[PDB]
């Protein structure tokens, strides 16, 4: 049956996964202690689905996910935390030293003798299921553990497993904000190595969610939990198709097709429309027109990239809850009726739709509110060239003085490698400005 | 003055290669240089000041070793007589035949023996009773940031290295402490010494090829010029000194492919650091050329630091790089050009200067 | 699972360690017997970073001492926390160098260095995986400089893959507690810019002015001036000993902050430092710390930073916080004061955060920074140096141990050259 391996890496991926599973478990009716009071009381139902949750004869459920690092301060937080007696204690640590936020230690000096354990567990998980294997790998640019290890793993899984769907809910570098001074390098190299193997690679950012949380929810003092729950609800808004049942479902092989025209252009964005608190949950209708208009607002985006200076090459919408599809079609028509938006000439269709019957849910202690519907948007657009044109300009400066390098060459790298990626990235920029030209006859 | 003058060469196919029909890729349009990835996706373009050609023996503008010497070496031999130190570099990965360009063979001699022979010739032209010329030699290497000697033998016990130091006199710059210096008059003699040096060089076979290098190699030739004879009594109030430094360098050595940990990896790391710092030094010299004042990171490496008087100041330099045209070896080849992109010394630069109003 | 060693030379290093172990023991729940009387399990999950274990749940540290005179030894042992240390680790000799660098790099240290390394190897091999080494050594004077530099050289010939780090006091302009500071200090920098990954300059004058102005203390003492250095040291590894929403380590702070390797001389800083009455008249928020940290007066170098720009800086906050507020304040700092920052680096700040705060506060912070304004310090020493060497003032005590004028001249260049590098970026 349909299944999906999940592979978290780095402090971003694991702090995200501890929310994704907190949500997945609360949806399917599970307690953190493995067992199932819910279906114990129902005496039936597949609801603890075999898509994510493997199942033993003893009633205990074990999820199909692994996660890694080379700094055990995280995984110990799991092993002691609330969720210790759920996951498989093959939580692969080799925490003998970190990656020093360089691509070199993560992809070569401490990327050797360690990767094989991960490949062994991945095979152990695949051979348990005779079904679909769409990968989800949650990493983050900049860091070494989340750039280099990922860059090594994808190029190897493309060799062992070949033609399967591989995805990435990666994190992007904020242009102004940063928690580092090497993100540009560690990002451009990763893009070069993962332009080819991967199929799609979604992208989010840390600044836009900050600005959201100050704007709508009236939150004053965020943390690094509240954002991750929004990432987790996004992921749920996707995976509802594979788990649950409803009108128009979208498997993982569909996202890679509908949204990746050329092999090299597979770097979309993302959005969740309703973001509200217990106070603003009232005082609002929450129709479908309101939502599908909000999805294309500049502010409700999740990367600081003005789309009005760009064009939408393709788009996919995934809804939840009680929905009436003529409202959806009316919304799409109202959208194409507008003029601020500009679709290309070679895609007058553009849109895709997927519907599911389940509502969303709530993580108690959270800012979001109980509702009766919700929506997610994903777009392959062209404004994001700007968010690459800045990065190379954050690159060409430093490399002009061969700075912040001596460590990198010190862990087994050739400097000329930089001078390749700058080209393979620049070519990419040309593509996002080649297609924007409309054809001529 | 600043006289970088980087060059690039293109070898021919081998006999083995022409049997296997190595697909040509690297092309020219004269001075400009182009390359075409066999996917036919993009065309990279590289310019240099000078461009040689040794692929077709019939084409116009053919680069035979006579041309190489007569274009690059002669200014060095000339300037050394004026009393200035000079240096010559060499880049190139294994298989590009640096051995063919520098040393050469008995039927097509390279650079080294030609330079030495012309030095001998001009010596025997200027040799009078008024003027004398003394030539002294030396040879060392660099490996894991240490220094060794090669001319000198060692103890037949084991790996009896030669630990040496680098120190700084306040006048003549840096030197080595413990070094062997020798005297020369015969070209056959320096050939003997050079063989004795190249034998003990630090190397190690790999999966790529047995004959590969892991250590940079300096060949130093000190010249002397004694003329000062006081008209009222023999007296050397001064004598001019001028240095020549040839050096052979190793490759870039990407280590994510040649994954053989231990010492083979811990030596390539230092090698690449040295290459990086040398590149920074030359990129700084190209700006020193333009009258602007800047810093130079001389002390950041070793091979830069035993060259400080010969590289900078009123000193003429050079560099060349052998390559391979066979499309099977594009990756290494690309770096073998991407290191030497100093052709754009000062192009597309902004200017804001206001020091006018020089009047009454 | 990773590790840090501690070496302690001279008088300064020993009297500092005697307060650093006093602060770490107070955070991990330790008592003078070396036993445990903590409250939370969370203090013991990573106690194996600084401390070893023992038979009966006693905990004993990886501390090593050097000094070439026992005048400090009995001062430690006859104290509150001078008895947990391993008596096999209290190395010493006799006949101290007397503030002569030559007597502490050539003659006596040459007798004692192997006896030091015989213990360093024991304390290394007994670890599982190693990270880097720590040290606490003054300059200007003798023992801590000479023997410390020698230890650094021997180690980084032995163990180069790993890290090295020092917390070195420096001389000061107004008053000197030794008449031959410049000479010994220059000779120390000649062998510490090459063989180091980071070193943290501290200056006694800055601590004095701090303790006079902010805390408004009347009867200070060296033992309480050292309380700020222990604080900083503690904060630097708080990313390693504890959890954190955005963890860090030593090597991360090394890569991010050291663009070219030779410029690895820092300028530290701690916050929130306040008086015993004036804590009621303040608030604990991120900006209340951020305005205090980039101030000129909560620094420890005796170097006005606003005479120059900052190549890069860092920060380690501690407490339940809001990262948005942190990153926003750092954005505004890079905005308003661009002239004090560099243009050819786009983001001259990073961050690092831990969620397990100190014993008595709800919030704390350390600040680290690689500034150009250290330039004016070295301009002094060379100046102070060269006029003395123009006349060979105190030379013969140094030539009387098998040395040469050459060894000084080199060092001078290696400082002046370094100075020039900084000036390359002092202008726009
Ligand atoms: C009861 C109480 O909370 O009073 C505070 C206090 O008044 C202040 C002034 C403390 C006090 O600090 C000083 O007395 C002091 C004076 C001059 C120079 C250095 C220290 C305090 O003594 C210091 C002490 O700080 C700590 O406990 C930290 O854990 C500190 N460790 C120790 O002080 C300590 C040292 C030896 C043995 C046991 C504990 C520390 C700081 C950073 C990292 C690790 C540990 C505390 C809370 C206070 C007193 C006790 C008054 C302050 O301490 C520090 C370094 O942050 C001085 O400024 C803070 C702000 C506090 O308000
Ligand atoms: N959204 C989100 N991002 C996080 C979180 N924690 C860390 N990050 C991101 O992590 C990035 C820092 O580099 P990382 O990807 O964390 O690298 P790492 O996990 O430390 O792994 P190493 O670099 O090897 O140490 C920053 O861009 C942060 O935004 C989190 O909890 N939520
Ligand atoms: N901050 C601080 N510095 C000290 C202390 N004791 C000594 N020093 C410094 O240490 C230097 C003396 O050098 P010293 O270590 O005695 O040389 P040694 O005798 O060879 O060990 C002086 O410059 C002081 O500034 C102290 O208790 N606190
Ligand atoms: Mg990490």
Residue numbers in the entry:
A (entry chain A): 1 to 441
B (entry chain K): 391 to 750
C (entry chain B): 1 to 428
From the paper:
KIF14 is a microtubule-based motor protein with essential roles during cell division. KIF14 belongs to the kinesin-3 family of motor proteins. As all kinesins, KIF14 possesses a highly conserved catalytic motor or head domain that contains nucleotide and microtubule binding sites, and where ATP hydrolysis is coupled to the generation of mechanical work. Here we report the near-atomic resolution structures of twenty KIF14-microtubule complexes corresponding to five distinct KIF14 constructs in four nucleotide conditions mimicking four key steps of the ATP hydrolysis cycle.
Construct K755 includes the neck-linker and part of the first coiled coil heptad repeat of the CC1 domain. The structure of the core motor domain of the MT- K755 and MT-K772 complexes in the Apo and ADP states conform to the open configuration, as it is also the case for the complexes with the shorter KIF14 constructs. However, different from the MT-K743-ADP/Apo and MT-K748-ADP/Apo maps, the MT-K755-ADP/Apo and the MT-K772-ADP/Apo maps show a neck-linker associated density going sideways reaching the motor domain of an adjacent protofilament. Because such density is not observed, the map is better fitted with a model in which the KIF14 dimer in the Apo and ADP states binds to the microtubule in a one-head-bound state. In this state, one head is bound to the microtubule with the nucleotide-binding pocket in the open configuration and the other is tethered and presumably in a semi-closed configuration similar to the microtubule-unbound KIF14-ADP crystal structure (K-ADP_4OZQ). The tethered motor domain remains mobile (disordered) and the dimer adopts a one-head-bound conformation similar to the MT-K755-Apo/ADP and MT-K772-Apo/ADP structures. The conformation of the neck-linker in the K772 and K755 Apo/ADP structures suggests that the tethered head is positioned sideways and toward the microtubule plus end (the direction of movement) relative to the trailing position seen in the two-head microtubule-bound intermediate (step 2).
